[PDB]
Symmetry: C3
Subunit: 251 residues, 3 copies
C-alpha cells in the first residue's frame, strides 16, 4: 500500500527548501526492501518527488527477468485514490514533468534492480541530488569524491621548453615539463609564449625540473606577469630533454 500525506504551493516550497528539481527524489528505506523471485517489496520506504511526500508500505513491484529494471514512482494527482504507483521499466524514463505548475504525470526513477531469470541479483539506488547555490559550512566529510573545475594549458615557453599545466579549483596547479632546452643562460627569460593570465601565480614560483637520463637538474621561475625565467645553468646549442612535475598555488 501507499500513503500520500497537499497544495501546489507546498510542493514548490518543499522543493526549494531541500534543493530538488523534478528529476530527482528524496528517499529513505526505514526498513529494508525484500526480494522474492522477480519482485521487490518496499516494506517501509518514504519518497519525496516533486515536493510531494509519500510512503511505500509493503508495496511490491514486479520485474522483468534477465534484465536491468528501472524502478519508477509515477505520480498522478487526479488519481485521488492511488496517486502513486510503481513501475519497472527497461530504461530510465524519468520525465521531469512539473506537477506543481502544470498537468501531467510525474515519472521519476529511484532504484535499479538487476535480475536473473528467477530472482534479483543486485540493486543500486538512484542518487538523491541536492542542488544548492552557495554553501557556508564548518566541516564536511566526503565518502566518495569531490569534483572541482579543471583547466589545462600547454605553453611553448621558448628555447624548446614545453609546460603542460593543470589547474584545479582555480588554485592548485601541477606543471609537467616536456620538450628539450637549448641556447639559454641563467637569469634569461625564455624566448616564447608567456603563461596565460588564469594560470599566473600571485607570487614568483620556482619549479624544479630534471634532465632525462642525467643526474642534473634545473629550475624555472613562473613570474606573476606570466614570464618564465630560466634558473638552470647555461645551456649551449645541444638540446637536453626536460621533464618533471612541479606544483604551486595561484592564490
Amino acid at each position: 500500500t501507499i500513503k500520500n500525506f497537499g497544495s501546489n504551493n507546498d510542493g514548490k516550497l518543499y522543493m526549494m527548501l531541500t534543493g530538488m528539481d523534478y528529476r530527482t527524489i528524496r528517499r529513505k528505506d526505514w526498513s529494508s526492501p525484500l526480494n522474492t523471485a522477480l519482485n521487490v517489496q518496499y516494506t517501509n520506504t518514504s519518497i519525496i518527488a516533486g515536493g510531494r511526500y509519500f510512503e511505500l508500505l509493503n508495496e511490491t513491484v514486479a520485474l522483468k527477468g534477465d534484465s536491468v529494471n528501472y524502478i519508477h514512482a509515477n505520480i498522478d494527482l487526479t488519481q485521488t485514490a492511488n496517486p502513486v504507483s510503481l513501475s519497472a521499466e527497461t530504461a530510465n524514463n524519468s520525465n521531469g514533468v512539473d506537477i506543481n505548475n502544470g498537468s501531467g504525470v510525474l515519472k521519476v526513477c529511484f532504484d535499479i534492480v538487476t535480475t536473473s531469470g528467477t530472482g534479483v541479483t543486485s540493486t543500486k539506488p538512484i542518487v538523491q541530488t541536492s542542488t544548492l547555490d552557495s554553501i557556508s559550512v564548518n566541516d564536511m566529510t566526503v565518502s566518495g569524491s569531490i569534483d572541482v573545475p579543471v583547466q589545462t594549458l600547454t605553453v611553448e615557453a621558448g628555447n624548446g621548453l614545453q609546460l603542460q599545466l593543470t589547474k584545479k579549483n582555480n588554485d592548485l596547479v601541477i606543471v609537467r615539463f616536456f620538450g628539450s632546452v637549448s641556447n639559454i643562460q641563467k637569469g634569461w627569460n625564455m624566448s616564447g609564449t608567456w603563461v596565460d593570465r588564469p594560470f599566473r601565480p600571485a607570487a614568483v614560483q620556482s619549479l624544479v625540473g630534471h634532465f632525462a637520463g642525467r643526474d642534473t637538474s634545473f629550475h624555472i621561475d613562473i613570474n606573476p606577469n606570466g614570464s618564465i625565467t630560466w634558473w638552470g645553468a647555461n645551456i649551449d646549442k645541444t638540446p637536453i630533454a626536460t621533464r618533471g612535475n612541479g606544483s604551486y598555488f595561484i592564490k
Copy 2:
C-alpha cells in the same frame, strides 16, 4: 500580481522553514519557473517563487520599473502590518537588505534578490543574488562544484638556519606547499639546520623530504622536515660561500 502563502502560526512555520533550509534573514530561496521578461526599463517576473524569512510567495506577471543607466537592486519587502499586501517589490540604488526578524518581532524585512543593470533603453544584464545555505557539518557521498571551494589557509615563514628560508602555505589544514628562499652555507649532510624549527600546525606526521634547486646551477639538494619540526640538511656539504636555494615541494600533514 503577488500570491502570499505563508501569511496570516505563520511565524512558527517561517522559522521551521528557515531552519530546514539553513537560511537567515539576509538571503532568499528563489526559482524562476519561467524567465522574467525585460521590456524597456522594466522587469516582468512571469512566474518566480521566493522564500524570504521562511515566507513563501509567488510573483506572477509582476513588473518592477527600473532606473535608467543604473545598477538596480531588486528587493522583496515584507511588512506584516500591511495585511492586504504584505509583500512588495522595489528597485533601489544599493543593496538595502536589513535582516529584520519578522517571525519574532515587528519591522519590515527587506531582502535583495536580483541585480538588474540598465542602459538608457533597457536591461543590459541581470545577476541573481546568491542563495546561501548556512550549514554546520555536512556528510555527503559526492559533490560537484561549478565555481570554487574556499578552504582555510595558513602561512608561515621559517628562518631554518644556515641562511635557508622556508615559506610554507597550508590549505585545508593538510596540503602544504613549501617555497625555498635564501642561500645556504656552512652545513654538512645530516646536520640539523641551526635556526628556527617548524611551528606545530605545520609539522607532518612522518618525515618529509623536499627537493630544492641551486639557482643558476645544475645541482640540487633536499631537506627533511621531521615530525618534531626540526629540519635536516641532505644536500652535499656546503662551504663558506652561500648558494641560493629555491623551489617548491609539497607534502601532506595527515
Copy 3:
C-alpha cells in the same frame, strides 16, 4: 515554557527530516535571542529546535545546572505524553539515544547544548553540531571554515632495484609520492624490476617525478606509466647503491 507545534504528525516529521537531511541523532537549532546564564541555570529566552522532524520553541525556559560540571542539555520527546511531549534535562553525559519516534514507540533523547559551569555559574557554552546528511550535492561555491575530510588511500611499493615508493592518494585524485630506499643496477630507460603500481594509483598519463640523492648534489626522475610500470630516467647506476629521497605530486584524473 515549551511550545509544541509538530505534534499525520509522523508523516510530517519524516517529511521534514528528509527535506533537511537529519537523522534521529542530530537537531536543527536556532537561538533567535541569546540564552541568559544566571547562577547555575541557563534560561532559553527564544530558541527553536527540530528533533526527529518535530519543531518546538523554548520560550523563557530555564534549565538548572550542576556546579563545576559539563552539563549536556537534552531535549526529550515522549509522544505518549500528549499534553507536554517535550522536556529538557541537564545530564552528566551525552545520552542521545537515536530513537525513531516517527516509526516506533519510545522516548527520543537528543543532546543540543553543552554548558560548562564553575561552582557558581556558567563559564562556557558550546552547541552540539547540526549535521546535514546528504547524498549528491551540486553547488556553485562553497566556503569551509573548519576542514574537508576526503578519502585517503596509501600504498607502499617495492619498485625494484632497491627503490621504494610510499604513495598517498586523496580525493581519488591528488597523489604525493615519497621516495625511499637506495637504487643500484639500473640504466636510463629501464623499467624498475619490482612491483608495479596498483591500479587505483595509476595515472591517466605518464608522470615524471623528480627525486634527490641524499647527501649529494645530484638528482633523478622516474616515470610512473599508465600501465603501472616505473621507468628510470636518472643517469645509469652501477653496483653501488645511492639513497633516493623526495616528494613528487601528480593528478590521476
